[PDB]
DNA sequence: TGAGGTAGTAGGTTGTA
DNA sequence: ACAACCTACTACCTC
């Protein structure tokens, strides 16, 4: 069973190739239209960057815009811009050969390719991207097959057949190169504020998944969700003919296998977890074993009256379910009470209190606080606009009283019921130990089990609850999580604690996520470290050893800084990146039954970047997506590095569902969403604070 | 909004002899 | 202008 990248290098060097230069006179889009004209007369592959063009052959129409110097010279492999102009050519090169011997189009960032299929008037299109890179003097071309999504036919079919232009109807300029989003008739629909009017012969409604048929949804949605197997087929038959066509570079016959890329293969293991013992398992410990930090928990109720109005679902019915989650907790070591300030608020929480949230809530903070609020709000509340019953939930209660809550809706109390009434429950639950004990067991049996512990552990973590730790030590003794967010114009900044080597602490900064500009300054980096080192001082009264910085995407940040401010303390760090979506895709290919598979732990490096497999997810939900590790600082081994991001994704102690990123980078990018949202304030604290999810 | 996974859509932020 | 990230939204499936 061989490893597989979706890669390939190759055998000619950087400077083993000769292009010709033609520099023009003395602004980063300069010479483009240069470049254009001479695609247009020379028909040829070319290049531009700023003010300097490279090809492969000479060009006989000079079009009137005479050179300043021409060369058939190499290029200084130790200056980066002659390689991002090399790297440009070649993949103008492949495009242009994909163009011309393939018939693909260049639609939007990829070529698009021939169609797959079509389902009820709607063409799925294949295409794929490509990447050109210079890694030491050695040239490696990486590429990601994806698809596109086509309604086939204009304004005019729909016109001719009766039906009304809709004034918000969403219509996209399909063609060829770039790609716009907005009986003869002339709609005058904005692009983003610009005025522009068409004949509206070639205008066509866009295809998402939003406003896509249900009918149609279901189909196109299983069509993108591909076996490991086929996508990666997919990928190299194309690749494979592009390949036998392409002239200007030369591969091995078997260019895909990560020996051929240079990169080393390392098979992780699964961690243990504790509880009270050591788990193999995080379901196993949750199942039958108690928790590794306990204690007392304040609950107080929230309940709607539309909730019994619509749904003939009554509070009893709420209590009891209530009542078996206390019952649960309590089994693992936690006690939990419902509070009984729900007294002058009886009757409370009608249609007209959501549509006056905004100047009827003010009253209620006595009442809920320093509680742990388990609303029941309806989902129509919460989505259905002018009433915005979540975002004015969590932006009051959270926002602003520093409240923890969690949202339970109709669908899961429906669930439960129904299967009371399967189970031939429903009779009594509530008060009664024994039924309480037989819907627990019947609980179990059921997926719907997977859901009550969910909201159970909803519940711990907002609550100051530690439910597990990692039973064996790592090679750092503290993390840090950074992240950045940009939307519409706010900026901000999510930061996340990991203090111990076994986790121990899951804590979120107590820092403002809230920037001023668009940057980290450096008052907030210097206050994030050291506020850490202080945090982890007081948990374990001793100073730490080693501390690893996890950035989400890349490294912007001042590094003199960091090594000013833990010089003085003296204690070594490491900065690390952690990215999502490297468009690339990593497999073991069987050949036995020539099928491609995926394993979770796996690491291919190279260098020190390293791409990991953690998640192991279903046939039919898709296919695994890497990480991509890459160590800035060279302290400790890579090895070290990548086993701690790996041991960090363990620590979901939110869900019991396995999620691929490490803790470090899932929660700060939660927090940043929040605080995006202003929906969390800082908490100072010793414990387990997790006041999203 | 029980939670996670993955895969389409449209835009936004850097930094670049 | 180009390249390599990031975000939001929708959808489905799994536990
Ligand atoms: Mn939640």
Request: glycine share 2%; hydrophobic share 40%; no cysteine.
């Given at each position: 069973m061989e490893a597989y990248i979706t890669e390939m290098v190759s055998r000619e060097r950087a400077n083993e190739l000769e292009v010709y230069v033609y520099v023009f006179p003395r602004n980063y889009e300069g010479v483009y239209h240069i470049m254009?004209?001479?695609?247009?007369?020379?028909?040829?592959?070319?290049?531009?960057?700023?003010?300097?063009?490279?090809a492969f052959s000479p060009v006989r129409h000079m079009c009137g815009y005479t050179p300043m110097e021409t060369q058939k010279r190499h290029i200084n492999i130790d200056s980066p811009f002659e390689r991002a102009l090399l790297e440009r050519l070649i993949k103008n090169s492949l495009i242009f050969t994909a163009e011309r011997h393939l018939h693909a189009k260049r639609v939007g960032?990829?070529?698009?390719?021939?169609?797959?299929?079509?389902?009820?008037?709607?063409?799925?299109?294949?295409?794929?991207?490509?990447?050109?890179?210079?890694?030491?003097?050695?040239?490696?071309?990486?590429?990601?097959?994806?698809?596109?999504?086509?309604?086939?036919y204009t304004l005019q079919s729909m016109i001719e057949q009766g039906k009304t232009i809709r004034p918000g109807m969403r219509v996209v300029h399909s063609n060829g190169r770039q790609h716009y989003t907005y009986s003869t008739r002339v709609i005058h629909v904005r692009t983003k504020e610009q005025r522009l009017s068409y004949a509206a012969t070639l205008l066509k409604p866009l295809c998402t998944f939003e406003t896509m048929q249900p009918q149609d949804v279901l189909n196109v949605s299983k069509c993108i969700k591909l076996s490991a197997s086929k996508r990666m087929k997919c990928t190299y038959r194309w690749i494979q003919q592009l390949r036998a066509q392409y002239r200007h570079l030369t591969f091995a016959p078997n260019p895909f296998t990560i020996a051929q890329n240079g990169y080393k293969l390392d098979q992780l293991s699964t961690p243990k977890v504790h509880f009270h013992r050591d788990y193999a398992t995080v379901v196993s410990g949750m199942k039958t074993g108690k928790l590794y930090k306990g204690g007392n928990i304040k609950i107080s109720v929230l309940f709607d009256e539309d909730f019994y109005l619509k749904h003939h679902i009554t509070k009893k019915d709420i209590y009891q379910f209530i009542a078996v989650l206390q019952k649960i907790a309590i089994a693992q070591g936690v006690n939990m009470t419902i509070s009984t300030s729900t007294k002058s608020i009886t009757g409370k929480f009608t249609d007209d209190f959501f549509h006056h949230f905004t100047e009827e809530v003010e009253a209620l903070q006595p009442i809920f606080a320093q509680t742990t609020v388990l609303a029941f709000i309806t989902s129509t509340h919460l989505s259905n606009k002018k009433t915005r019953s979540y975002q004015?939930?969590?932006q009051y209660f959270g926002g602003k009283w520093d409240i923890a809550s969690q949202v339970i809706t109709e669908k899961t109390i429906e669930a439960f019921q129904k299967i009371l009434h399967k189970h031939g429950l429903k009779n009594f639950y509530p008060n009664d130990e024994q039924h309480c004990l037989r819907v627990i067991d019947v609980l179990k049996n059921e997926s719907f089990y997977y859901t009550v512990m969910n909201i159970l552990l909803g519940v711990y973590v907002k609550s100051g609850i530690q439910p597990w730790i990692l039973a064996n030590t790592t090679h750092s003794d503290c993390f840090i999580g950074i992240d950045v967010s940009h939307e519409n114009g706010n900026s901000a900044a999510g930061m996340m604690n990991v203090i111990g080597s076994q986790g121990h602490l899951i804590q979120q900064a107590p820092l403002?996520?809230?920037?001023?500009?668009?940057?980290?300054?450096?008052?907030?980096?210097?206050?994030?470290?050291?506020?850490?080192?202080?945090?982890?001082?007081?948990?374990?009264?001793?100073?730490?050893?080693?501390?690893?910085?996890?950035?989400?995407?890349?490294?912007?940040?001042?590094?003199?800084?960091?090594?000013?401010?833990?010089?003085?303390?003296?204690?070594?760090?490491?900065?690390?990146?952690?990215?999502?979506?490297?468009?690339?895709?990593?497999?073991?290919?069987?050949?036995?039954?020539?099928?491609?598979?995926?394993?979770?732990g796996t690491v291919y490096q190279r260098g020190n970047e390293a791409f990991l497999c953690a998640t192991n997810p279903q046939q039919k939900v898709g296919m695994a997506q890497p990480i991509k590790i890459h160590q800035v600082t060279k302290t400790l081994p890579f090895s070290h590095i990548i086993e701690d991001v790996?041991?960090?994704?363990?620590?979901?102690?939110?869900?019991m569902n396995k999620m691929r990123l490490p803790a470090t980078i899932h929660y700060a990018d939660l927090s940043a969403t929040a605080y995006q949202r202003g929906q969390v304030m800082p908490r100072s604290g010793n414990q387990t604070n997790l006041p999203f999810v």
């Open positions: 254009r004209a001479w695609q247009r007369a020379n028909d040829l592959p070319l290049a531009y960057n700023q003010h300097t063009i490279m960032h990829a070529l698009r390719l021939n169609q797959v299929q079509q389902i009820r008037q709607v063409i799925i299109y294949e295409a794929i991207e490509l990447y050109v890179n210079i890694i030491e003097n050695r040239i490696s071309i990486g590429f990601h097959l994806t698809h596109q999504f086509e309604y086939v004015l939930l969590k403002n996520g809230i920037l001023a500009g668009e940057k980290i300054d450096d008052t907030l980096l210097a206050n994030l470290l050291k506020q850490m080192i202080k945090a982890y001082h007081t948990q374990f009264q001793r100073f730490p050893k080693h501390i690893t910085i996890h950035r989400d995407g890349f490294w912007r940040e001042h590094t003199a800084l960091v090594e000013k401010i833990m010089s003085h303390y003296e204690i070594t760090y490491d900065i690390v990146e952690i990215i999502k979506k490297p468009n690339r895709r990593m497999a073991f290919f069987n050949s036995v039954d020539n099928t491609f598979s995926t394993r979770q790996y041991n960090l994704s363990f620590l979901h102690i939110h869900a």
